[PDB]
């Protein structure tokens, strides 16, 4: 070691911290929700706080942090994450013991929390301008890449323990080391459980002091803002990067948030060990084809052309592998078995399920031996049911003729479709899994190239400057709008018991699929676009 | 990586 | 703070005759209880630990059993660091001994004193 790659063991440390606090985020959420007793707007505010905080600062912090100290700030803005991440876990330890106590036939401790998330924003706030910005102005030439790729493949060790951890904290009871473990009542599948998430959110923070100690032992050196942010803004190949990225990054977040609603709907499977050394050694990979093969500017911008040209080249690919609609009664045909429908809204009831007084709001899908799934069994007229097998007895609103055995024999759930598309379900994921590495071969590119296009003087500003418009346009409003274009196409709404905005439970697979493919999809064609012109006017430039 | 949200700086 | 330990001790427990009113009182000694919650549990003879009452940091939300809801009362006192509880309209049920809880790092219990009330 040179000293130089010390600072590589210490920011690949504080990824993987800021990975590890981001997983601990995003999975105990619901502990927090049951243990509070908070609605969902709170706990959707407690949620956004990190966001919030991230946003506020990163501007300032990484323009004010480029001139001064800079593993200095790295390492007190890691020690921040430390105190917000026992801050976290510090209203589990003054407020008490925790408490918590159909057949279908024809309260203030938050703000702790809240302000926890903040210093967690600002505890992500200065390790990825600064420090990259430290790898570029520090590092020999050509090497930058390789070690981006060498930090992005460790950073998914994080996930990793993020995803053990949580797993095995949320197996015990939230009071663990205080009671006696025998006098639990409740199981982890019980719904009044809370699992120890206060464990999370102290591994968390005690890791990023950890991470936050070998940034002070590094030196220095190893051997206005609007004007600068103006000449930032005014840069035209920059601000087409930022929003070519944006758009990128976009289509990347619409369309891994609803991959497993699409493989529910589609090919009906319930929602990785191969996936993540995939991703792993695409990024690993694509460093070292930067790193290798000696290019220069423009080369690694048709590098990072190429990858989004052969991701959207098996993209389009999804549109081929279609399963059929599903057959259901009441939504994209009538209940009797003969005649569809035009529309699913107010749809007329039929002659069999008139006798049967249940809820037609009730969502409990069922399907007989026709291959017909009915919406619950009320509605299927099965009068009778049986007990660990399921069957539904005597069920009347199966049209055949006159077979005796075709009217019982039903069991519950979604049952699956025809072993035709499952193969196309295999296919999907393999598809998938190119498409994902194809990505990870873009990478690095997309920070690599920042640093080359904006002046020396600017490249932490910059890189802070795309890290808003990654953060703030994709990050929160992408999911937004890709939600909306989703649940526009919702078959069958659930009526809630407060109000609305209650989660559909079954879709029209089609056009669900063709939305949810197509906004994706325009959305990586017009960035491909930008790519083109990005490519004509850089090489005009140049 | 698996995942939502992305960066990708993560998963 | 540099103390050793929370120290609980609680007064005004005794006897009561019929629906009549009560008032006890908890102060703590030590590391400051200021940001804990603060409990009021019961034990009866025979029985385990009840959860009575509970008061927060400033007083702000206070949280009662479903036994025992609209006629107990419990307050803070931040100079005098003491928790009150008023308890008002008893019944022969809370025969018992009344117990106090902080949580400063670690749990930590009360002495407690009888709290038998007369039937009449």
Redesign the interface.
């Given at each position: 070691c040179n000293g130089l790659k010390m600072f590589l063991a210490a920011l690949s440390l504080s990824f993987i911290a800021?990975?590890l606090g981001?997983?601990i985020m995003k999975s105990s959420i619901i502990h927090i929700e049951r243990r509070f007793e908070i609605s969902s707007s709170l706990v959707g505010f407690i949620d956004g706080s990190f966001e919030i905080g991230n946003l506020l600062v990163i501007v300032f912090v990484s323009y004010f942090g480029s001139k001064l100290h800079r593993p200095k700030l790295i390492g007190i803005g890691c020690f921040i994450m430390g105190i917000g991440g026992v801050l976290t876990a510090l209203p589990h330890?003054?407020?008490?013991?925790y408490?918590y106590s159909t057949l279908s036939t024809c309260?203030?401790?938050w703000i702790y929390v809240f302000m926890g998330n903040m210093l967690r924003g600002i505890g992500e706030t200065p390790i990825?301008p600064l420090g990259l910005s430290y790898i570029d102005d520090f590092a020999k030439e050509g090497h930058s890449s390789l070690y981006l790729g060498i930090l992005?493949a460790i950073?998914?060790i994080?996930?990793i323990i993020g995803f053990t951890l949580g797993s095995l904290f949320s197996k015990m009871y939230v009071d663990i080391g205080?009671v006696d473990l025998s006098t639990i009542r409740i199981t982890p599948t019980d719904s009044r459980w809370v699992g120890a998430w206060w464990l999370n959110f102290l591994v968390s923070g005690l890791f990023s002091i950890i991470s936050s100690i070998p940034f002070f032992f590094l030196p220095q050196t190893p051997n206005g803002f609007f004007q600068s942010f103006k000449s930032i803004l005014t840069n035209p190949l920059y601000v087409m990067f930022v929003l070519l990225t944006l758009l990128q990054?976009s289509s990347?977040?619409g369309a891994?948030?609803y991959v497993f609603k699409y493989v529910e709907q589609q090919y009906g499977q319930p929602s990785?060990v191969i996936?993540?050394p995939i991703?792993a050694s695409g990024?690993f990979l694509g460093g070292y084809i930067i790193k290798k093969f000696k290019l220069n500017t423009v080369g690694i911008a048709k590098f990072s052309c190429f990858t989004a040209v052969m991701s959207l080249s098996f993209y389009l690919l999804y549109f081929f592998i279609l399963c059929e609609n599903k057959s259901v009664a009441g939504l994209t045909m009538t209940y009797d078995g003969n005649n569809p429908v035009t529309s699913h809204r107010d749809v007329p009831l039929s002659y069999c399920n008139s006798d049967c007084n249940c809820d037609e709001s009730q969502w409990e899908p069922v399907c007989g031996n026709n291959g017909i799934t009915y919406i619950s069994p009320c509605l299927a007229g099965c009068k009778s049911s049986s007990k660990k097998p399921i069957v539904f007895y005597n069920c009347s609103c199966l049209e055949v003729t006159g077979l005796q055995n075709r009217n019982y024999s039903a069991h519950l759930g979604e049952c699956p479709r025809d072993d035709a598309c499952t193969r196309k379900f295999y296919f999907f994921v393999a598809i998938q899994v190119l498409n994902l590495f194809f990505?990870?071969l873009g990478?690095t590119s997309?920070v690599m190239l920042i640093v080359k296009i904006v002046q020396p003087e600017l490249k932490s500003l910059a890189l802070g400057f795309h890290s808003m418009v990654?953060?703030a346009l994709?990050?929160i409003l992408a999911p937004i709008y890709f939600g909306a274009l989703i649940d526009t196409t919702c078959i069958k709404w659930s009526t809630n018991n407060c109000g609305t905005r209650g989660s559909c439970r079954t879709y029209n697979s089609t056009s669900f699929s063709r939305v949810y493919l197509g906004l994706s999809s325009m959305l990586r064609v017009s960035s491909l676009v930008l790519y083109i012109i990005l490519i004509y006017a850089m090489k005009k430039k140049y | 990586x698996?995942?939502?949200?992305?960066?990708?700086?993560?998963? | 703070g540099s103390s050793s330990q929370v120290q609980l001790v609680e007064s005004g427990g005794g006897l009561v005759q019929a629906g009549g009113s009560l008032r006890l009182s908890c102060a703590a000694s030590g590391f400051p209880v200021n940001?804990?919650?603060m409990?009021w549990y019961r034990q009866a003879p025979g029985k385990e630990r009840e959860?009575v009452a509970?008061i927060?940091?400033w007083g702000?939300?206070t949280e009662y059993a479903d036994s025992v809801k609209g006629r107990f009362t419990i307050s803070r006192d931040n100079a005098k660091n003491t928790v009150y509880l008023q308890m008002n309209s008893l019944k022969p049920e809370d025969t018992a001994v009344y117990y106090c809880?902080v949580?400063?790092?670690r749990?930590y219990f009360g002495q407690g004193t009888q709290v038998s009330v007369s039937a009449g």
């Open positions: 800021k990975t981001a997983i330890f003054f407020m008490g013991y408490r309260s203030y401790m990825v992005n950073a998914m994080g996930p205080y990054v990347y977040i891994f948030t990785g996936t993540i991703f990024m990505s990870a990478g997309h990654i953060r994709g990050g | 698996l995942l939502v949200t992305a960066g990708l700086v993560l998963a | 940001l804990s919650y409990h959860w509970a927060s940091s702000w939300h809880h949580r400063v790092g749990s």
